[PDB]
Amino acid sequence: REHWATRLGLILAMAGNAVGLGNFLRFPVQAAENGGGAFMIPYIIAFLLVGIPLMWIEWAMGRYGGAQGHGTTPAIFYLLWRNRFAKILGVFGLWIPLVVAIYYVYIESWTLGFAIKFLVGLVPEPPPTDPDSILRPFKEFLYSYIGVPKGDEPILKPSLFAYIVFLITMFINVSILIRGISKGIERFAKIAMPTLFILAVFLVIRVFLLETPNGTAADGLNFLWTPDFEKLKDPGVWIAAVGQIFFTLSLGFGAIITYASYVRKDQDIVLSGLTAATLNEKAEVILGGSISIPAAVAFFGVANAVAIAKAGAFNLGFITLPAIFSQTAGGTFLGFLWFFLLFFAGLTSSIAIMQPMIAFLEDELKLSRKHAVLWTAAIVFFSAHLVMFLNKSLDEMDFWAGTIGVVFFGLTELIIFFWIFGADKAWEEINRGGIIKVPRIYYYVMRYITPAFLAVLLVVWAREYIPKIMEETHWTVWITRFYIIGLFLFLTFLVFLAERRRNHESAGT
Numbered sequence: 478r479e480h481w482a483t484r485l486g487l488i489l490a491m492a493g494n495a496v497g498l499g500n501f502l503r504f505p506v507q508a509a510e511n512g513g514g515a516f517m518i519p520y521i522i523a524f525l526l527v528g529i530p531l532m533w534i535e536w537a538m539g540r541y542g543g544a545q546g547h548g549t550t551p552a553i554f555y556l557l558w559r560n561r562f563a564k565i566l567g568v569f570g571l572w573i574p575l576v577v578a579i580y581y582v583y584i585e586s587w588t589l590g591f592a593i594k595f596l597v598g599l600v601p602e603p604p605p606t607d608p609d610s611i612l613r614p615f616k617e618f619l620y621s622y623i624g625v626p627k628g629d630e631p632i633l634k635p636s637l638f639a640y641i642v643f644l645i646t647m648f649i650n651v652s653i654l655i656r657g658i659s660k661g662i663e664r665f666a667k668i669a670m671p672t673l674f675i676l677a678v679f680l681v682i683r684v685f686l687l688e689t690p691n692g693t694a695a696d697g698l699n700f701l702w703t704p705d706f707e708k709l710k711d712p713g714v715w716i717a718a719v720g721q722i723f724f725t726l727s728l729g730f731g732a733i734i735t736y737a738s739y740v741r742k743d744q745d746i747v748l749s750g751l752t753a754a755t756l757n758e759k760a761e762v763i764l765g766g767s768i769s770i771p772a773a774v775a776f777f778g779v780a781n782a783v784a785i786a787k788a789g790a791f792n793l794g795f796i797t798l799p800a801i802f803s804q805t806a807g808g809t810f811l812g813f814l815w816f817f818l819l820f821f822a823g824l825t826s827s828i829a830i831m832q833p834m835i836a837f838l839e840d841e842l843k844l845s846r847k848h849a850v851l852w853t854a855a856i857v858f859f860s861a862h863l864v865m866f867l868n869k870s871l872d873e874m875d876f877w878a879g880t881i882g883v884v885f886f887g888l889t890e891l892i893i894f895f896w897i898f899g900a901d902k903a904w905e906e907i908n909r910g911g912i913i914k915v916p917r918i919y920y921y922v923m924r925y926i927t928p929a930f931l932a933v934l935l936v937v938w939a940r941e942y943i944p945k946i947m948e949e950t951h952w953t954v955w956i957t958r959f960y961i962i963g964l965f966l967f968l969t970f971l972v973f974l975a976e977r978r979r980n981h982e983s984a985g986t
């Protein structure tokens with residue numbers, strides 16, 4: 478069994494797991510689209526009532542399972558609840574991270590592609606006034622890279638460069654994962670995190686130096702950090718805030734659990750878990766929130782910045798920011814640093830969502846690390862073609878797996894660990910070996926508050942928001958739904974084979 482060599486490696490690996498594209502690309506959009514400061518209140522509450530408690534729960538379930546040679550939920554859920562059904566529900570712990578990896582790695586490859594082009598200076602050349610004359614060249618740049626449709630058809634035509642970069646991205650992910658936990662994920666985390674931090678701070682510093690006739694970077698911070706209690710009664714903001722919390726902290730993806738399964742039985746998961754969660758939040762609200770938003774508001778003002786965030790989730794990070802940078806000396810290089818930052822941020826997170834499948838193949842099907850990594854890479858690479866060529870396929874996978882799936886799974890793992898397994902056993906398991914104890918009140922939060930909070934959230938969602946996404950979408954969404962449902966059946970079949978394999982082994986022993 479592989480174990481994290483050092484505590485710093487563990488923290489930086491777990492921090493690398495959480496700190497990713499969600500901090501720098503997703504958070505800014507979610508905040509701006511929901512009133513900025515009006516989004517922060519529910520976000521902070523969601524972090525305290527959902528983020529923190531679930532982080533500890535996943536670290537606990539992981540370490541508990543790893544002690545018995547299991548790093549994924551199909552097996553761990555069964556250990557906590559001896560029921561054939563626990564194995565089915567556990568499949569989501571392999572499905573979610575696999576589906577998310579299918580589109581996450583692709584988006585990650587974009588940042589590598591852009592980074593390369595911006596470094597070499599193969600970027601557009603804007604006409605020397607007029608906002609549209611500045612932004613259009615960059616919009617075209619993105620649209621040509623990923624191949625956005627021009628006609629009436631929902632078909633994408635990625636550039637050859639984009640495709641080749643995706644292959645390289647997969648290769649880089651494999652090169653790290655194939656070396657294992659300590660010599661792969663950990664070695665890399667110790668290099669990537671410090672780099673990521675320096676790049677992020679440098680960018681924040683450069684961004685503040687932005688002052689135009691429309692505003693300053695300070696105006697952006699005020700927008701993001703000014704309370705608006707008139708939206709606290711809006712369910713949509715709460716759904717957005719909770720969704721962001723889950724995504725940014727890697728909760729409900731089965732990633733934290735798998736990583737924690739490599740933590741030694743005696744090791745502290747309380748302080749370690751809290752540190753990883755805190756590092757992510759700092760990287761999100763302080764770093765992530767201080768780059769994109771302040772820069773957009775500085776050049777276009779609050780109103781226009783918000784409109785740009787509402788048009789295309791990728792606008793602000795792949796079109797707007799590099800466009801804004803292009804108007805300053807060394808702006809192309811600054812764009813390179815922005816995309817290089819995103820690449821490392823994503824790379825440290827993509828290896829985390831691919832490890833669960835790898836761990837399952839090693840733990841349950843007894844495959845060698847080499848074979849487990851290559852097969853996982855093959856499944857992701859192949860499946861990724863659907864996201865690369867079918868328009869809005871990405872949007873669909875992100876919803877079922879990265880949005881609904883994670884909240885549902887988060888509630889499932891809590892119920893299984895804190896209700897079925899036992900609230901008092903769970904509590905003991907979480908605190909065992911801890912350098913610090915979990916505050917007493919959190920017992921009540923985990924047992925009553927968190928589950929009730931997520932239960933209400935899921936109910937409202939399925940009533941006033943999801944029916945539209947089941948009756949107001951293009952027919953091609955069914956191609957993606959069909960395929961991801963097939964992935965679930967495939968994983969269920971593997972769980973079944975793992976059962977038959979273990980049974981046969983128990984007879985020979």
Ligand SMILES: CCCCCCCCO[C@@H]1O[C@H](CO)[C@@H](O)[C@H](O)[C@H]1O
Pocket residue numbers: 634635636637638640859862865
């Ligand atoms: C995975 C099973 C079959 C995959 C076939 C992939 C064929 C990719 O084909 C490539 O697509 C690129 C755009 O994405 C084009 O730019 C290339 O010219 C084209 O050769």
Ligand SMILES: CCCCCCCCO[C@@H]1O[C@H](CO)[C@@H](O)[C@H](O)[C@H]1O
Pocket residue numbers: 593637638641642645
């Ligand atoms: C550097 C790591 C991967 C580099 C892949 C480069 C793929 C280049 O691909 C080429 O790009 C040219 C534009 O630059 C196009 O005009 C060509 O049609 C295209 O085939």
Ligand SMILES: CCCCCCCCO[C@@H]1O[C@H](CO)[C@@H](O)[C@H](O)[C@H]1O
Pocket residue numbers: 633634635861862863864866867
């Ligand atoms: C993902 C499920 C199916 C993916 C099918 C991808 C088929 C790619 O097909 C290729 O597309 C290229 C343009 O991108 C064309 O230039 C090639 O002639 C065509 O063969």
Ligand SMILES: CCCCCCCCO[C@@H]1O[C@H](CO)[C@@H](O)[C@H](O)[C@H]1O
Pocket residue numbers: 632862863866867
């Ligand atoms: C399914 C996910 C992506 C599918 C991309 C399909 C791109 C198809 O492209 C089409 O391929 C046909 C042959 O199959 C050709 O006869 C058409 O002329 C060509 O436009």
Ligand SMILES: CNCCCN1c2ccccc2CCc2ccccc21
Pocket residue numbers: 498499502503506507581584790791871872875
């Ligand atoms: C509305 N569709 C775009 C969905 C994808 N998306 C992702 C997903 C993974 C990593 C980054 C992002 C950045 C853009 C973004 C913003 C808000 C929700 C989802 C997303």
Ligand SMILES: CC(C)C[C@H](N)C(=O)O
Pocket residue numbers: 494495496497498499500577724725726727730732826827829830
């Ligand atoms: C899916 C997770 C690994 C995503 C990561 N926590 C991020 O914020 O990008």
Ligand SMILES: [Cl-]
Pocket residue numbers: 621622636637638639
């Ligand atoms: Cl290109």
Ligand code: NA
Pocket residue numbers: 494495496497499500724725726727757761
């Ligand atoms: Na994050």
Ligand code: NA
Pocket residue numbers: 492493494495496497498821822823824825826827
């Ligand atoms: Na990361």
